[PDB]
Write an enzyme that holds these catalytic residues in place. Sequence first.
Site, PDB file in Angstrom:
ATOM      1  N   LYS A  35      41.285  -7.270 -22.535  1.00 24.26           N
ATOM      2  CA  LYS A  35      41.911  -8.273 -23.366  1.00 24.26           C
ATOM      3  C   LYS A  35      41.381  -8.135 -24.795  1.00 24.26           C
ATOM      4  CE  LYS A  35      42.495 -13.278 -22.782  1.00 24.26           C
ATOM      5  NZ  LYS A  35      41.097 -13.782 -22.854  1.00 24.26           N
ATOM      6  N   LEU A  72      41.054   5.617 -21.497  1.00 25.00           N
ATOM      7  CA  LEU A  72      40.497   5.347 -20.154  1.00 25.00           C
ATOM      8  C   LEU A  72      40.963   4.023 -19.587  1.00 25.00           C
ATOM      9  CD1 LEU A  72      36.636   6.219 -20.588  1.00 25.00           C
ATOM     10  CD2 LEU A  72      38.549   7.629 -19.380  1.00 25.00           C
ATOM     11  N   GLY A  73      41.587   3.204 -20.449  1.00 30.35           N
ATOM     12  CA  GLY A  73      42.160   1.903 -20.082  1.00 30.35           C
ATOM     13  C   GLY A  73      42.041   0.920 -21.233  1.00 30.35           C
ATOM     14  N   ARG A  74      41.868  -0.360 -20.892  1.00 35.62           N
ATOM     15  CA  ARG A  74      41.825  -1.419 -21.908  1.00 35.62           C
ATOM     16  C   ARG A  74      41.360  -2.722 -21.332  1.00 35.62           C
ATOM     17  NH1 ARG A  74      47.726  -3.470 -24.021  1.00 35.62           N
ATOM     18  NH2 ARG A  74      46.335  -3.230 -25.844  1.00 35.62           N
ATOM     19  N   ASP A 124      30.275 -13.368 -17.256  1.00 35.54           N
ATOM     20  CA  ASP A 124      31.602 -12.771 -16.858  1.00 35.54           C
ATOM     21  C   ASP A 124      31.427 -11.771 -15.719  1.00 35.54           C
ATOM     22  OD1 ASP A 124      34.437 -12.577 -17.069  1.00 35.54           O
ATOM     23  OD2 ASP A 124      34.285 -11.063 -18.702  1.00 35.54           O
ATOM     24  N   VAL A 153      39.499   1.319 -24.535  1.00 31.90           N
ATOM     25  CA  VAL A 153      38.415   2.158 -24.166  1.00 31.90           C
ATOM     26  C   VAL A 153      38.929   3.617 -24.025  1.00 31.90           C
ATOM     27  CG1 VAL A 153      36.445   2.311 -22.775  1.00 31.90           C
ATOM     28  CG2 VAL A 153      37.758   0.159 -22.759  1.00 31.90           C
ATOM     29  N   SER A 204      39.616  -4.990 -26.027  1.00 32.83           N
ATOM     30  CA  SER A 204      39.228  -3.633 -26.420  1.00 32.83           C
ATOM     31  C   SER A 204      40.100  -2.547 -25.811  1.00 32.83           C
ATOM     32  CB  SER A 204      37.736  -3.357 -26.096  1.00 32.83           C
ATOM     33  OG  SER A 204      37.622  -2.813 -24.781  1.00 32.83           O
TER      34      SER A 204
HETATM   35  N1  LIG Z   1      31.155   3.350 -20.546  1.00 33.96           N
HETATM   36  C1  LIG Z   1      32.380   3.519 -19.996  1.00 33.96           C
HETATM   37  N2  LIG Z   1      32.788   4.675 -19.328  1.00 33.96           N
HETATM   38  C2  LIG Z   1      34.027   4.773 -18.800  1.00 33.96           C
HETATM   39  N3  LIG Z   1      34.927   3.761 -18.864  1.00 33.96           N
HETATM   40  C3  LIG Z   1      34.616   2.587 -19.486  1.00 33.96           C
HETATM   41  C4  LIG Z   1      33.307   2.372 -20.094  1.00 33.96           C
HETATM   42  N4  LIG Z   1      33.308   1.130 -20.623  1.00 33.96           N
HETATM   43  C5  LIG Z   1      34.502   0.566 -20.376  1.00 33.96           C
HETATM   44  N5  LIG Z   1      35.265   1.452 -19.709  1.00 33.96           N
HETATM   45  C6  LIG Z   1      36.647   1.405 -19.193  1.00 33.96           C
HETATM   46  O1  LIG Z   1      37.549   0.536 -19.855  1.00 33.96           O
HETATM   47  C7  LIG Z   1      38.519   0.188 -18.857  1.00 33.96           C
HETATM   48  C8  LIG Z   1      38.609  -1.291 -19.070  1.00 33.96           C
HETATM   49  O2  LIG Z   1      37.239  -1.654 -19.227  1.00 33.96           O
HETATM   50  P1  LIG Z   1      36.919  -2.943 -20.143  1.00 33.96           P
HETATM   51  O3  LIG Z   1      36.539  -4.107 -19.249  1.00 33.96           O
HETATM   52  O4  LIG Z   1      38.076  -3.098 -21.116  1.00 33.96           O
HETATM   53  O5  LIG Z   1      35.583  -2.475 -20.920  1.00 33.96           O
HETATM   54  P2  LIG Z   1      35.113  -3.053 -22.347  1.00 33.96           P
HETATM   55  O6  LIG Z   1      35.016  -1.756 -23.151  1.00 33.96           O
HETATM   56  O7  LIG Z   1      33.768  -3.782 -22.234  1.00 33.96           O
HETATM   57  N6  LIG Z   1      36.493  -4.009 -22.975  1.00 33.96           N
HETATM   58  P3  LIG Z   1      36.594  -5.741 -23.302  1.00 33.96           P
HETATM   59  O8  LIG Z   1      36.898  -6.450 -21.978  1.00 33.96           O
HETATM   60  O9  LIG Z   1      37.675  -5.933 -24.367  1.00 33.96           O
HETATM   61  O10 LIG Z   1      35.206  -5.968 -23.870  1.00 33.96           O
HETATM   62  C9  LIG Z   1      37.979   0.526 -17.462  1.00 33.96           C
HETATM   63  O11 LIG Z   1      38.675   1.586 -16.796  1.00 33.96           O
HETATM   64  C10 LIG Z   1      36.602   1.052 -17.718  1.00 33.96           C
HETATM   65  O12 LIG Z   1      36.387   2.246 -16.956  1.00 33.96           O
END
Ligand SMILES: Nc1ncnc2c1ncn2[C@@H]1O[C@H](COP(=O)(O)OP(=O)(O)NP(=O)(O)O)[C@@H](O)[C@H]1O
Length: 334
Positions: free
Chosen positions: A48, A44-46, A155, A52, A50
């Site tokens: 810095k 679904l993406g990423r 953040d 996802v 993680s």
């Molecule tokens: N619960 C979710 N459902 C759908 N997409 C998600 C969800 N959580 C994170 N993402 C996706 O992850 C992509 C990048 O999100 P991100 O800010 O990396 O989330 P995070 O999982 O909290 N990663 P990090 O910044 O490393 O903690 C985006 O397109 C979001 O849609």
Amino acid sequence: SGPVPSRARVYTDVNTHRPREYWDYESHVVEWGNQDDYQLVRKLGRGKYSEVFEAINITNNEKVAVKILKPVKKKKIKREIKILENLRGGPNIITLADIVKDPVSRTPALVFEHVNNTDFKQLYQTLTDYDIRFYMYEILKALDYCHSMGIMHRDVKPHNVLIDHEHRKLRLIDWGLAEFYHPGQEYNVRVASRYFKGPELLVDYQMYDYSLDMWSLGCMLASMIFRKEPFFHGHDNYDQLVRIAKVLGTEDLYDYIDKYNIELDPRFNDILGRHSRKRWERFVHSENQHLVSPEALDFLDKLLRYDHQSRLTAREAMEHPYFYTVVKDQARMG
Ligand SMILES: Nc1ncnc2c1ncn2[C@@H]1O[C@H](COP(=O)(O)OP(=O)(O)NP(=O)(O)O)[C@@H](O)[C@H]1O
Ligand SMILES: [Cl-]
Ligand SMILES: [Cl-]
Ligand SMILES: [Cl-]
């Protein structure tokens, strides 16, 4: 005779009043789940820190989201896990549904509720003025909630707000830089994203509080009502404060520093100089004038203030007349 102390105006002792274990996250012991219970569907993406993935919970075929943390100290993992556990159930905050380990890497894999991979930053182009108000109020519910549970996000930015516009649902995500507020603690200022950093981080004032988030929310609001992304576009840390001073003026900045007896680099003083306060109306153009109401400008003013202790709280923000009508929203999906 260092800098002057500060304690939050709101929710000052909420962690104090709770048992130790609520906030003493280093002590937490994670319960691992069943890794063969979630299968990844697609990326679904990423970020810095993680990756996802969309995934499925096989035992009932329910749709989830799975954030696989890259390596990193267990101190932070436990901090983000505990916070997310503490906040579960709160309005508009992403729900942590399991934690498991990645089969091969053996790193933590956080299972959340599934949203649309669509965020507030994607929707900047199209939002009506009503919709900016509406989603701003939804974010405030999350901040008020988290602040009341003793937690600073640190953040707040459009990238961290997921919106399911179809269903008019928003979730505040990415709690990886979140911390627990304790009156008198000093916090690292390497939190948040340059453009959303409060002047407190920019002047190395470490005894900050929830009100950091309220500055960041102001910065998000300003970009949205003026269609300038970001609104304060600093090219480095010092320039970030210079951009703010070019709008909000230097007289209050210098009154803030001498309020808290903060030590500013003399050479950086020379760089700031003197800038007159621009009236918020300077940034109104034909392209954004439909988003800019007097209540919008009054609200932003009350958020974008140098003195962290002067800024509206989330609750006081919720009562501001920028949200008078939108609180009456009749919940039409289409
Ligand atoms: N619960 C979710 N459902 C759908 N997409 C998600 C969800 N959580 C994170 N993402 C996706 O992850 C992509 C990048 O999100 P991100 O800010 O990396 O989330 P995070 O999982 O909290 N990663 P990090 O910044 O490393 O903690 C985006 O397109 C979001 O849609
Ligand atoms: Cl962003
Ligand atoms: Cl910290
Ligand atoms: Cl608050």
